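Summary for the steering committee. The consortium agreed at its last meeting that each partner would contribute one worked example illustrating the joint modelling workflow. Our contribution is presented below. We chose a case with several input lines so that the handling of multiple components could be demonstrated. No manual editing was applied between input and output; the record is shown as generated.
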Amino acid sequence: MDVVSLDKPFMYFEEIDNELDYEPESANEVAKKLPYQGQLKLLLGELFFLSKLQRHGILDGATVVYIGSAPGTHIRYLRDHFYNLGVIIKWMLIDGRHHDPILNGLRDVTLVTRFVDEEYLRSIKKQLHPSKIILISDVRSPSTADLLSNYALQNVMISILNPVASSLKWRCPFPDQWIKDFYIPHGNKMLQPFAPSYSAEMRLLSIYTGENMRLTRVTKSDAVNYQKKMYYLNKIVRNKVVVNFDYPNQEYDYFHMYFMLRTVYCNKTFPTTKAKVLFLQQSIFRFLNIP
Amino acid sequence: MDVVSLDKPFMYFEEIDNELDYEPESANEVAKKLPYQGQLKLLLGELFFLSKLQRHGILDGATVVYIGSAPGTHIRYLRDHFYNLGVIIKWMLIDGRHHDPILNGLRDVTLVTRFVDEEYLRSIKKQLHPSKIILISDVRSPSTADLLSNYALQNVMISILNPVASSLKWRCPFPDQWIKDFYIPHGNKMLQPFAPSYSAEMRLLSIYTGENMRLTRVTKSDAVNYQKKMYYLNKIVRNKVVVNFDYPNQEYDYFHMYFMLRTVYCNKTFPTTKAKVLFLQQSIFRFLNIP
Ligand SMILES: Nc1ncnc2c1ncn2[C@@H]1O[C@H](CSCC[C@H](N)C(=O)O)[C@@H](O)[C@H]1O
Ligand SMILES: Nc1ncnc2c1ncn2[C@@H]1O[C@H](CSCC[C@H](N)C(=O)O)[C@@H](O)[C@H]1O
Ligand SMILES: C[n+]1cn([C@@H]2O[C@H](CO)[C@@H](O)[C@H]2O)c2nc(N)[nH]c(=O)c21
Ligand SMILES: C[n+]1cn([C@@H]2O[C@H](CO)[C@@H](O)[C@H]2O)c2nc(N)[nH]c(=O)c21
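What follows is the complete predicted structure of the assembly.
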């Protein structure tokens, strides 16, 4: 077995302290071990993001505009969570596909069947005004050309919507498939537990202060770094069993999940962090129908 | 007469301490008092900008890419100045119109007869590489739609060229002619002496550190501010005679010019700032054929 003692997990991309030469054969390896692993991945990353905003006092009263939200089964848990905690939020879920029916009938959540474009963004901006907007993007067209296209639209979501914060899907294009350098918003590169086995994807978390918007260029060299660091994390790190982690599951992803969940706010008072986390995880797994 | 004692002139937009309701009648008022006032305006603003970069040690060895450079008569003085001081610079002047023949025959200056577009920017970027690039933009298509168009291209010049610094033409669109909010690069809003009488134009000076690019949104309210502050400066301030300014010309613009010129580097050693400035101004006026 691949056992180890870890202090904490890598929470952000910059923390990854090693790299590996990408083995193309890994793409043939089993991408997922858990049922509904994708919603879980999204639910933890989004609970983490939103709890932070709560922590900074910018969640209550905002309208969360989620683009690329369908089916969105996990968004129901996210909504109930903050709704039961008492935070006042309006959810506007927009996608061209259809949303899970469990999202229907909630006065606080509006579902829109529309693929968004720049023109549309301007109309929802005029219709949401003057509410504070929190943006979450998970749109998917893929080719490097498809990616750049998606990232370009995400930057327009921000310029037009002008949110107080944003969570954006972020996977750097492959170096061997470079087309051109581009700019993404500045933010924390949040690592995702339960992402597909060899996924190089993360979520960009940003909070907008003042009336400025800071961007950062992404070059092919960066793409090489992304590939090597994410390859090292997936092949080695995520396959570690943290023996000094006293919890029902000791695999790296549960250790990583633990650290994300310990930052979430709950109503019930627990004697320990372990008790709150166990509670949140059980609740999450039961909701998603994960054994 | 409109006399006054001033400590220093407003060097940046943010410094302007007052505003006035814009009088549309002012547009009918004489826009220029000096022959070749336009080149003078450009020459001071560009000497100011470049001396700063020299001061920060980023001028020597760069290639200055000037877009919207023709005729460019004053660029000859700028080139000779740094060339005689010993700074090593290559000038690449690109415009669709023709350049003043005085710019020909200099091995260090290349003239290009091309209107630039995104695709072209990419080719000059590949051809200039790996030199450090300093960008100066003075392109002019006008309608608010024309402006946004120009500002949009200027932002692309920066993203593609990736200069170490930039000087960009900047005039906010009129509030009563608003179309949409937009982003311009962060920079110092340099005020311009000898600009047309009621001009609301300035130059955005930026130095790029790291691999980031910071932008700032411009709203209609900002457009109202720009209009009022620039109207106050043009109607009142620029019409002041600084009696405590001991110089051959006491008008505000010469006082403003003095402060810009006192930052320029020269070969000759002068006993006073007044002597260096008088020297630089005389030299500039004689070169431009201004009495
Ligand atoms: N311009 C656009 N506007 C809205 N949705 C878009 C889009 N381009 C792609 N999409 C949507 O982005 C989605 C990617 S899958 C998203 C999964 C969802 N976040 C979940 O929680 O289940 C697709 O449903 C696709 O229709
Ligand atoms: N895309 C583009 N590329 C290059 N030049 C452009 C342009 N769009 C407009 N221009 C040029 O921008 C110029 C504006 S006048 C510029 C004056 C010049 N800076 C001087 O020192 O004399 C025009 O000559 C026009 O041809
Ligand atoms: C992380 N990853 C996945 N694939 C490819 O994506 C497919 C779907 O997941 C995989 O089958 C693999 O071919 C990669 N290809 C390259 N060049 N570099 C990578 O980092 C990489
Ligand atoms: C600074 N300025 C000039 N013009 C207009 O531009 C023409 C050419 O210089 C002027 O004749 C005037 O009509 C302005 N119009 C408005 N609404 N607001 C301004 O601040 C302004």
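Residues 1-291 of chain B form a domain with the Rossmann fold fold (CATH 3.40.50.150). The first helix of chain B runs from residue 37 to 55.
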